[PDB]
Design a protein around this motif. Structure first.
Motif, PDB file in Angstrom:
ATOM      1  N   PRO A  97      12.175   5.129  11.057  1.00  0.00           N
ATOM      2  CA  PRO A  97      12.124   3.742  10.604  1.00  0.00           C
ATOM      3  C   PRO A  97      11.620   3.682   9.189  1.00  0.00           C
ATOM      4  CG  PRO A  97      10.299   4.209  12.143  1.00  0.00           C
ATOM      5  CD  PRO A  97      11.172   5.433  12.103  1.00  0.00           C
ATOM      6  N   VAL A  98      11.864   2.574   8.509  1.00  0.00           N
ATOM      7  CA  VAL A  98      11.269   2.390   7.203  1.00  0.00           C
ATOM      8  C   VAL A  98       9.997   1.580   7.427  1.00  0.00           C
ATOM      9  CG1 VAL A  98      11.509   1.499   4.881  1.00  0.00           C
ATOM     10  CG2 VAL A  98      13.521   2.458   6.044  1.00  0.00           C
TER      11      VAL A  98
ATOM     12  N   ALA B 233       0.819  -1.214   0.000  1.00  0.00           N
ATOM     13  CA  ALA B 233       0.000   0.000   0.000  1.00  0.00           C
ATOM     14  C   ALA B 233       0.863   1.279   0.000  1.00  0.00           C
ATOM     15  CB  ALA B 233      -0.966   0.002   1.198  1.00  0.00           C
ATOM     16  N   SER B 234       1.938   1.290   0.792  1.00  0.00           N
ATOM     17  CA  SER B 234       2.731   2.502   0.984  1.00  0.00           C
ATOM     18  C   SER B 234       4.050   2.263   1.713  1.00  0.00           C
ATOM     19  CB  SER B 234       1.920   3.571   1.724  1.00  0.00           C
ATOM     20  OG  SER B 234       1.728   3.234   3.085  1.00  0.00           O
ATOM     21  N   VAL B 235       4.998   3.156   1.446  1.00  0.00           N
ATOM     22  CA  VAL B 235       6.275   3.190   2.145  1.00  0.00           C
ATOM     23  C   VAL B 235       6.442   4.558   2.800  1.00  0.00           C
ATOM     24  CG1 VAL B 235       8.773   2.895   1.988  1.00  0.00           C
ATOM     25  CG2 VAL B 235       7.298   1.524   0.508  1.00  0.00           C
ATOM     26  N   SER B 236       7.008   4.545   3.998  1.00  0.00           N
ATOM     27  CA  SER B 236       7.354   5.760   4.717  1.00  0.00           C
ATOM     28  C   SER B 236       8.808   5.649   5.176  1.00  0.00           C
ATOM     29  CB  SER B 236       6.420   5.971   5.908  1.00  0.00           C
ATOM     30  OG  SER B 236       6.832   7.091   6.679  1.00  0.00           O
ATOM     31  N   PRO B 237       9.600   6.727   4.996  1.00  0.00           N
ATOM     32  CA  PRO B 237       9.196   8.058   4.497  1.00  0.00           C
ATOM     33  C   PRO B 237       8.845   8.075   3.016  1.00  0.00           C
ATOM     34  CG  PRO B 237      11.346   8.132   5.609  1.00  0.00           C
ATOM     35  CD  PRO B 237      11.031   6.694   5.338  1.00  0.00           C
TER      36      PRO B 237
ATOM     37  N   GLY C 227      13.813   6.467  -2.728  1.00  0.00           N
ATOM     38  CA  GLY C 227      14.970   6.900  -1.971  1.00  0.00           C
ATOM     39  C   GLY C 227      14.584   8.082  -1.117  1.00  0.00           C
ATOM     40  N   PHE C 228      15.196   8.172   0.055  1.00  0.00           N
ATOM     41  CA  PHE C 228      15.099   9.351   0.902  1.00  0.00           C
ATOM     42  C   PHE C 228      16.456   9.677   1.551  1.00  0.00           C
ATOM     43  CE2 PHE C 228      14.012   5.770   3.709  1.00  0.00           C
ATOM     44  CZ  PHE C 228      14.738   6.054   4.880  1.00  0.00           C
TER      45      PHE C 228
ATOM     46  N   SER D 284      18.085   3.883   0.208  1.00  0.00           N
ATOM     47  CA  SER D 284      17.254   3.281  -0.854  1.00  0.00           C
ATOM     48  C   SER D 284      16.356   2.178  -0.336  1.00  0.00           C
ATOM     49  CB  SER D 284      18.116   2.692  -1.966  1.00  0.00           C
ATOM     50  OG  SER D 284      18.758   3.727  -2.683  1.00  0.00           O
ATOM     51  N   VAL D 285      15.088   2.206  -0.741  1.00  0.00           N
ATOM     52  CA  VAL D 285      14.148   1.157  -0.368  1.00  0.00           C
ATOM     53  C   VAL D 285      13.548   0.501  -1.607  1.00  0.00           C
ATOM     54  CG1 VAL D 285      12.263   0.550   1.118  1.00  0.00           C
ATOM     55  CG2 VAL D 285      13.586   2.577   1.597  1.00  0.00           C
TER      56      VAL D 285
END
Length: 216
Positions: free
Chosen positions: A21-22, A6-10, A84-85, A75-76
């Motif tokens: 946290p990721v 559904a989603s990644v944070s950040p 990337g963040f 990188s995720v």
């Protein structure tokens, strides 16, 4: 049958504090957690280690051991998604139950050692390694959201300012004009890290979501 992401944070391209946290949220509760954890690829120039924590049935987070380095890329990858963040400065807030202080450092430099009032023995501030979760200029503190009726003697309803969420269960660093005389001297709050309005304002203006908050 593998649940979709559904989603990644950040968010992609965010600049976050060094304890962020990721967080990976899924469309359905997850049955095969190990499979999801294997699907989650996190890359950082310093080869940071960490662990997965399941915080809802459909939500896992990867918590970096000893913080990300400041000003790094992360990188995720997970399933069809990549992003990337970056991290910003290492801004560490240390709340000390015994010393009644909240000390804030940027990249090792101590910026301020502020008077604070933490939780009373019966509503103590949880010891642990946390991070700044949100920044709210004005927030209503309602004891009902921590399982306490308004009429019970431990109940309260009051609007607070400069609020930084520390735990998912509702500890905050915030402005407490009512306990200024206790700050630096005694622990009188219902679990929150109580600062003077000026110190709270300063910190509110300095803090980034992800910034480490240590309680010792």
């Amino acid at each position: 049958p593998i649940p979709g992401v559904a989603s990644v944070s950040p968010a992609n391209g965010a600049v976050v504090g060094v304890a962020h946290p990721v967080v990976v949220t899924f469309t359905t509760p997850v049955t095969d957690r190990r499979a999801v954890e294997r699907s989650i690829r996190i890359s950082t120039p310093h080869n940071t280690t960490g662990h997965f924590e399941w915080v809802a049935s459909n939500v896992v987070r990867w918590v970096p051991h000893r913080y990300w380095p400041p000003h790094t890329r992360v990188s995720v990858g997970v399933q069809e998604l990549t992003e990337g963040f970056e991290t910003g400065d290492a801004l560490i807030g240390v709340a000390s139950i015994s010393a009644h202080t909240f000390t804030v450092s940027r990249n090792g430099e101590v910026l301020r050692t502020m008077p604070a009032s933490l939780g009373k023995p019966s509503r103590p501030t949880p010891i642990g390694s946390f991070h700044a979760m949100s920044k709210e200029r004005t927030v209503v503190m309602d004891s009902r959201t921590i399982g306490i009726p308004l009429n019970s003697s431990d109940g309260y309803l009051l609007t607070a300012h400069y609020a930084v969420r520390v735990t998912w269960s509702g500890v905050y660093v915030h402005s407490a004009p009512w306990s200024v005389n206790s700050q630096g001297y005694a622990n009188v709050s219902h679990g929150c890290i109580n600062l003077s309005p000026d110190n709270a304002a300063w910190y509110f203006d300095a803090v980034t979501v992800g910034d480490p908050i240590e309680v010792v």
